[PDB]
Amino acid sequence: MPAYACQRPTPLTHHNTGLSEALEILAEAAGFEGSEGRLLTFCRAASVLKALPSPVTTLSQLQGLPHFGEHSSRVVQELLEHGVCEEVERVRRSERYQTMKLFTQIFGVGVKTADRWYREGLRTLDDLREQPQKLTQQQKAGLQHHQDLSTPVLRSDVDALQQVVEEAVGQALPGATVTLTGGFRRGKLQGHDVDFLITHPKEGQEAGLLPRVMCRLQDQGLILYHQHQAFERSFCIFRLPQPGSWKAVRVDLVVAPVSQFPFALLGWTGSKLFQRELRRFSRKEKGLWLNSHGLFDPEQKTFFQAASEEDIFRHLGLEYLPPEQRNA
DNA sequence: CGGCGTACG
DNA sequence: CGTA
DNA sequence: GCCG
Numbered sequence: 001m002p003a004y005a006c007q008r009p010t011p012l013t014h015h016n017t018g019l020s021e022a023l024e025i026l027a028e029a030a031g032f033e034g035s036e037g038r039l040l041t042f043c044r045a046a047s048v049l050k051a052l053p054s055p056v057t058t059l060s061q062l063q064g065l066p067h068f069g070e071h072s073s074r075v076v077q078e079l080l081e082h083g084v085c086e087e088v089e090r091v092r093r094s095e096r097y098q099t100m101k102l103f104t105q106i107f108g109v110g111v112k113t114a115d116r117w118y119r120e121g122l123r124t125l126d127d128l129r130e131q132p133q134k135l136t137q138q139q140k141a142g143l144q145h146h147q148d149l150s151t152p153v154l155r156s157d158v159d160a161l162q163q164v165v166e167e168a169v170g171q172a173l174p175g176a177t178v179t180l181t182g183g184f185r186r187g188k189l190q191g192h193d194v195d196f197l198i199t200h201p202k203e204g205q206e207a208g209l210l211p212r213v214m215c216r217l218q219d220q221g222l223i224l225y226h227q228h229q230a231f232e233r234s235f236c237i238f239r240l241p242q243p244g245s246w247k248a249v250r251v252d253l254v255v256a257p258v259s260q261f262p263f264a265l266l267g268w269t270g271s272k273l274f275q276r277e278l279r280r281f282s283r284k285e286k287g288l289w290l291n292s293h294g295l296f297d298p299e300q301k302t303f304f305q306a307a308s309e310e311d312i313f314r315h316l317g318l319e320y321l322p323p324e325q326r327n328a
Numbered sequence: 329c330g331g332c333g334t335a336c337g
Numbered sequence: 338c339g340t341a
Numbered sequence: 342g343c344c345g
C-alpha cells in the first residue's frame with residue numbers, strides 16, 4: 001500500500017465503508033477545531049481503507065498500512081470489537097460538532113465564521129436569520145436557499161443543466177465547450193453541486209468569457225445568486241426545473257485556456273484529497289509544483305506542456321488513474 | 329522535529 | 338474572509 | 342496524527 005493516495009486506485013464504493021465513515025467524522029471534527037494536520041491524517045487513513053481490496057476484519061490487517069498509528073488503529077479496533085467507537089459517538093452527539101457542521105454547511109460560511117458565531121452563543125439557522133445584519137449577501141443567499149442546497153443533485157439532473165449552460169456558452173463564444181468535472185466525472189450518482197469546466201479550442205479566445213456567460217444565464221432567469229449579478233471562476237445558485245416547480249442547486253463554472261485544460265480537468269475532477277495528495281507528491285517526491293494551471297520545474301523555470309491527463313501522470317512517474325479511481 | 333495543496337472571488 |  |  002503506497003503512502004500517497006495518488007499512487008493507488010480508489011473506487012467510489014469499497015469494502016470498508018463504516019470504518020472510513022468513522023475516521024472521516026474525526027477528520028471533520030479536527031477541521032472544526034483548526035487542527036489541519038490531524039484532519040489530514042484521519043482523511044488519509046480513511047482513504048487507505050477505501051483502497052483495500054476486501055474488508056478489514058482483524059486489527060492485524062492494519063499492520064504496515066500507512067497512516068495507521070495508535071489513534072486510528074484504536075478507532076478501528078473498537079469498531080471491530082463493539083460496532084461503535086466511543087470517541088466517534090461522543091463527537092457525533094456533541095453540541096460543538098453538530099453546530100459547526102450545520103453552520104459550515106451554509107454557502108458563504110467557513111470554519112472561522114462558524115466558530116465565531118458558536119462562541120457568540122448561536123446554535124440554529126433561525127438564530128442566524130434573526131440577526132441578518134451580521135450576514136454577507138453571499139451568506140444571506142446560502143441561508144435562504146439552505147434547504148434546497150441540502151438535497152442531493154441527481155446525476156439524472158445534470159444533462160439537462162449542462163445543455164442550458166452550453167446554450168449560453170455557445171452564444172457567448174461559438175465553439176466554446178463545457179465539460180462535466182467534479183464528483184459526477186468520478187462516477188458519483190448524487191452530488192452537492194455540479195462543476196463545469198469551459199474552454200475554447202483556439203488559445204486566447206476564452207479571455208473574458210465567463211462574464212459573458214454569466215450575463216446570458218442571468219438574462220435567461222436561471223441565476224438565483226452569483227457574485228457579479230474580470231473573473232474566471234463563478235460559484236452560483238441555479239434554478240433547476242422540477243415537476244410543477246423548481247429547486248435551487250449550486251453550480252460552479254471555471255474557464256481555462258485550452259493550453260491549461262488538462263491541468264484544469266485534473267484539478268477540478270478531484271477528489272479534493274486526491275488533488276492535495278497529488279500536489280504534495282509532485283512537490284515532495286518529484287520537485288515539481290502542480291496547480292490547476294500547470295506543472296512547474298523550479299530548477300529549469302519551465303512549464304510542462306501537457307496534452308492530456310495521461311501526460312500529467314506520466315510526467316509525474318505515476319500510473320494513470322481514470323477519474324473513477326480518484327475517489328480518495 | 330517540520331510538514332501538511334494551491335489556487336481564485 | 339469566502340470559494341473550488 | 343502520522344511520516345520521513
Ligand SMILES: Nc1ccn([C@@H]2O[C@H](COP(=O)(O)CP(=O)(O)OP(=O)(O)O)[C@@H](O)[C@H]2O)c(=O)n1
Binds near residue numbers: 181266269276341
Ligand atoms: N478544497 C478543494 C475543493 C475542491 N477541489 C476540487 O474541486 C472539485 C470540485 O469540488 P466540490 O467542492 O464541488 C466537491 P465534489 O468532489 O465535486 O463532490 P460534491 O460536489 O458532490 O460534494 C474537486 O473534485 C477537486 O477537484 C479542490 O481541489 N480543493
Ligand SMILES: [Cl-]
Binds near residue numbers: 035036037038039
Ligand atoms: Cl493538527
Ligand SMILES: [Cl-]
Binds near residue numbers: 245246
Ligand atoms: Cl421555473
Ligand SMILES: [Cl-]
Binds near residue numbers: 262265308310
Ligand atoms: Cl485530458
Ligand SMILES: [Cl-]
Binds near residue numbers: 267292293334
Ligand atoms: Cl489551482
Ligand SMILES: [Mg+2]
Binds near residue numbers: 183184191192193195
Ligand atoms: Mg462538486
Ligand SMILES: [Mg+2]
Binds near residue numbers: 195252
Ligand atoms: Mg463545486
Ligand code: NA
Binds near residue numbers: 103105106110
Ligand atoms: Na460553507
